[PDB]
């Protein structure tokens with residue numbers, strides 16, 4: 001089953017801002033998760049063809065991945081840190097919806113999420 005167009009990483013008519021919190025989300029939260037040993041399946045949109053997951057986009061109607069989030073952060077797509085945090089939460093939730101508890105990909109998601117919650121705990125107050 002085939003791949004949809006990926007989520008946008010630009011949108012000229014969407015409002016956006018730069019904040020120290022969004023910068024922390026790029027410099028710290030994304031960079032740290034990206035370098036983890038379990039990050040690779042989350043670094044790009046799910047390719048349902050290559051991975052032989054033909055049901056994926058029958059079940060996941062709001063897909064999200066850290067490649068997308070990385071480009072959104074780099075391109076100043078967001079209005080505030082909350083919009084970005086939702087994207088990470090969408091990514092994790094999709095994983096938990098599509099797969100079974102304790103599947104390898106779910107353990108990977110859980111490790112990344114643990115780390116995510118740790119880094120978000122030190123999100124600086126908006127300056």
Ligand SMILES: CCn1cnc2c1c(=O)[nH]c(=O)n2Cc1ccc(Cl)cc1
Pocket residue numbers: 041042046051053094095098099104105
């Ligand atoms: C997080 C999106 N994603 C990327 N690859 C995935 C998935 C997924 O949700 N379920 C999957 O089954 N696979 C394939 C897969 C399965 C196990 C491992 Cl260790 C890696 C990828």
